Amino acid sequence: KNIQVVVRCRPFNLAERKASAHSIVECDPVRKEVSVRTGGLADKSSRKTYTFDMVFGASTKQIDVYRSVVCPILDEVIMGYNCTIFAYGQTGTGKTFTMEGERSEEDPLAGIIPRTLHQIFEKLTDNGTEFSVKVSLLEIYNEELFDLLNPSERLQMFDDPRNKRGVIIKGLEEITVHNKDEVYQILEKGAAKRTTAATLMNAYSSRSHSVFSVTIHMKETTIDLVKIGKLNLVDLAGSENQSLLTLGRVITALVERTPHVPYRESKLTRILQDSLGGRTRTSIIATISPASLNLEETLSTLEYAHRAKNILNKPE
Amino acid sequence: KNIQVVVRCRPFNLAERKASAHSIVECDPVRKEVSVRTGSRKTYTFDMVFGASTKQIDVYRSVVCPILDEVIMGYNCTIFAYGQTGTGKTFTMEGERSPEDPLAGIIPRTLHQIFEKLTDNGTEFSVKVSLLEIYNEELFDLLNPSSDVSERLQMFDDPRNKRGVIIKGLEEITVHNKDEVYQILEKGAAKRTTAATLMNAYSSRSHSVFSVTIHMKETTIDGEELVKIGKLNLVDLAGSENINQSLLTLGRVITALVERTPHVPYRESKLTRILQDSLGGRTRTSIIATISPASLNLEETLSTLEYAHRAKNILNKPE
Ligand SMILES: Nc1ncnc2c1ncn2[C@@H]1O[C@H](COP(=O)(O)OP(=O)(O)O)[C@@H](O)[C@H]1O
Ligand SMILES: Nc1ncnc2c1ncn2[C@@H]1O[C@H](COP(=O)(O)OP(=O)(O)O)[C@@H](O)[C@H]1O
Ligand SMILES: [Mg+2]
Numbered sequence: 001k002n003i004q005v006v007v008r009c010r011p012f013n014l015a016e017r018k019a020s021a022h023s024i025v026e027c028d029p030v031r032k033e034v035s036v037r038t039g040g041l042a043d044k045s046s047r048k049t050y051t052f053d054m055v056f057g058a059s060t061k062q063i064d065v066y067r068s069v070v071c072p073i074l075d076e077v078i079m080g081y082n083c084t085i086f087a088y089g090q091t092g093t094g095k096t097f098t099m100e101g102e103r104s105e106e107d108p109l110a111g112i113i114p115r116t117l118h119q120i121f122e123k124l125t126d127n128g129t130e131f132s133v134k135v136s137l138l139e140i141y142n143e144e145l146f147d148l149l150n151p152s153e154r155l156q157m158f159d160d161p162r163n164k165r166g167v168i169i170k171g172l173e174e175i176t177v178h179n180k181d182e183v184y185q186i187l188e189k190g191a192a193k194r195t196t197a198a199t200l201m202n203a204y205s206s207r208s209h210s211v212f213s214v215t216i217h218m219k220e221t222t223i224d225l226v227k228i229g230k231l232n233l234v235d236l237a238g239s240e241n242q243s244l245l246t247l248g249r250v251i252t253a254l255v256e257r258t259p260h261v262p263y264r265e266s267k268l269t270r271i272l273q274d275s276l277g278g279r280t281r282t283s284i285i286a287t288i289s290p291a292s293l294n295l296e297e298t299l300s301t302l303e304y305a306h307r308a309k310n311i312l313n314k315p316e
Numbered sequence: 317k318n319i320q321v322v323v324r325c326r327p328f329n330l331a332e333r334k335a336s337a338h339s340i341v342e343c344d345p346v347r348k349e350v351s352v353r354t355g356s357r358k359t360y361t362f363d364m365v366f367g368a369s370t371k372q373i374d375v376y377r378s379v380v381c382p383i384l385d386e387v388i389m390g391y392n393c394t395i396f397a398y399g400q401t402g403t404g405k406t407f408t409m410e411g412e413r414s415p416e417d418p419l420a421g422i423i424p425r426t427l428h429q430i431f432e433k434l435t436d437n438g439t440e441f442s443v444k445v446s447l448l449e450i451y452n453e454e455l456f457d458l459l460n461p462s463s464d465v466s467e468r469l470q471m472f473d474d475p476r477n478k479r480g481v482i483i484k485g486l487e488e489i490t491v492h493n494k495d496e497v498y499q500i501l502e503k504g505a506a507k508r509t510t511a512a513t514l515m516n517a518y519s520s521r522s523h524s525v526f527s528v529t530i531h532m533k534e535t536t537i538d539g540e541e542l543v544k545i546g547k548l549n550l551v552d553l554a555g556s557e558n559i560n561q562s563l564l565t566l567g568r569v570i571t572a573l574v575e576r577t578p579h580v581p582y583r584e585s586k587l588t589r590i591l592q593d594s595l596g597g598r599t600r601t602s603i604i605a606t607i608s609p610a611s612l613n614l615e616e617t618l619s620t621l622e623y624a625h626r627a628k629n630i631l632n633k634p635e
């Protein structure tokens with residue numbers, strides 16, 4: 001199916017160890033099942049089991065998330081389509097770790113954004129396509145758009161007369177990427193602007209949607225195609241506002257194929273409408289904690305993910 | 317005033333540094349002020365404010381010394397640690413043992429000072445301690461060595477005292493030396509862990525009540541013979557992110573005692589009922605509200621300061 005919903009459980013954090021939290025999550029990648037103990041350790045009946053397209057346990061490496069989730073989407077983007085990958089879940093559960101990763105050929109801790117830019121340059125260089133890569137990074141905080149790549153303030157959004165499904169975010173910085181490695185410089189500039197916004201506007205990353213958009217202009221010739229590909233890598237606000245519920249309803253409507261998809265009822269869904277309403281690949285990575293301490297927010301994340309795409313539990 | 321409300325801010329933790337969290341709390345010990353940047357600072361005034369650099373010994377001297385003095389005079393006192401999981405309730409109430417330990421909290425320091433003071437002035441004394449856990453309004457004995465994990469304690473009215481309760485079968489361990497407290501705390505932690513695993517009685521969702529009772533007889537020729545009973549309740553509350561009904565009931569009990577309103581609703585939670593004899597009776601009570609300085613915990617920090625402010629409303633001084 002075009003809409004893929006997957007769950008990634010992170011390892012325990014130090015806060016969870018110090019709080020004497022217990023492990024309440026069991027990840028079965030084979031059966032694509034997540035089970036959460038809501039009762040005693042001898043109360044096996046009081047488990048809630050959820051089924052998804054894929055389940056990544058705490059030991060899952062960055063490269064393995066990339067290969068399973070991103071590779072099929074990037075293939076579609078290179079064919080000249082507009083696709084979106086979301087990271088959804090509680091602050092601290094690994095949305096940013098999944099979407100960007102860390103540093104401290106590819107860094108093993110590299111997330112989807114750096115790996116995607118690496119693979120674009122590798123694949124398009126390898127098959128001799130004529131291509132250019134530009135990237136934008138904007139933040140949505142309190143329903144206002146902030147440009148994280150403008151080296152100089154809210155962005156204005158209006159309808160694209162060329163496309164009913166499109167918007168124009170006027171003056172949005174689109175940085176040309178010249179090499180595979182330049183993504184890290186761009187991410188550093190973004191993080192510096194993100195920090196400035198947190199200090200002065202209280203625009204905390206955990207309370208903001210981050211939309212990283214890569215656009216690829218391609219011309220492919222064979223002796224015997226003009227393509228535009230777009231990938232939106234969306235690091236959502238912590239799931240612990242109305243925009244997340246609107247996104248939920250937009251995804252459910254696309255899975256169940258109902259006539260009315262409420263793109264217009266949030267800035268998030270309006271901005272991504274062109275990359276959602278095209279029979280395109282979309283993936284949601286729901287990130288969760290394994291710890292008893294975060295039971296309520298883990299269950300809320302799994303309920304959200306289940307409501308987005310209802311997959312039935314199979315018999316054991 | 318007999319009800320003291322203080323705020324203790326912990327240092328940043330690794331998670332907060334790695335997340336590039338911003339400091340959103342300013343602690344002014346001199347002005348007894350905590351200010352939180354809400355983006356527009358919200359300023360709160362308390363009896364004392366301890367910043368991130370505050371040592372364990374300095375919390376003990378400011379908060380506990382005046383209370384223990386009153387307990388030794390034969391009164392019943394309570395100290396609460398209130399706030400978000402990870403902000404240092406247990407660190408404040410028990411502390412830790414490094415690899416008097418500088419990291420020792422209120423419980424070990426209190427037992428040390430009881431033995432030192434009463435030995436020093438030649439008082440005839442005995443010390444007993446109980447440790448119970450309240451989870452989902454049910455009482456678990458953490459010092460009973462034989463009891464089944466699923467065994468709950470029963471509470472009855474004390475016919476000798478309308479304000480008192482009898483917690484039937486509650487283990488009360490005689491403390492023979494200053495150092496024995498650590499062994500007792502270890503036995504408690506082991507029972508706590510067993511209860512978490514089998515009964516889902518998670519420590520971060522439970523109230524811990526450590527009660528020390530001191531029987532004292534002080535004799536002076538040409539002076540008085542004093543027969544005294546002192547009680548100190550050291551209460552490590554459930555994480556405040558849990559707001560249960562019991563934390564709101566405690567809130568209402570403290571507000572009623574500060575504002576001196578006619579009905580104090582002790583009976584509306586097991587926590588406030590158990591501590592009723594040690595509350596309101598013109599005895600010293602202290603609440604230590606623990607907070608994080610980091611942006612990541614803004615919502616729960618504001619909730620803690622609002623709770624603490626609602627318990628004892630002190631007006632901000634002119635700027
Ligand atoms: N799957 C994972 N494996 C290892 N560490 C992880 C994982 N997910 C998150 N982390 C770590 O957990 C912390 C919080 O992750 P972060 O991406 O900031 O969460 P979020 O963006 O959802 O608030 C960071 O230290 C990060 O490195
Ligand atoms: N004031 C403080 N100074 C130093 N470390 C602290 C302080 N408060 C808390 N900590 C540390 O923070 C962690 C969490 O504290 P803890 O006592 O478990 O919090 P709580 O009991 O409120 O959940 C522990 O590792 C503890 O040592
Ligand atoms: Mg993040």
Ligand SMILES: [Mg+2]
Binds near residue numbers: 519552
């Ligand atoms: Mg604790």
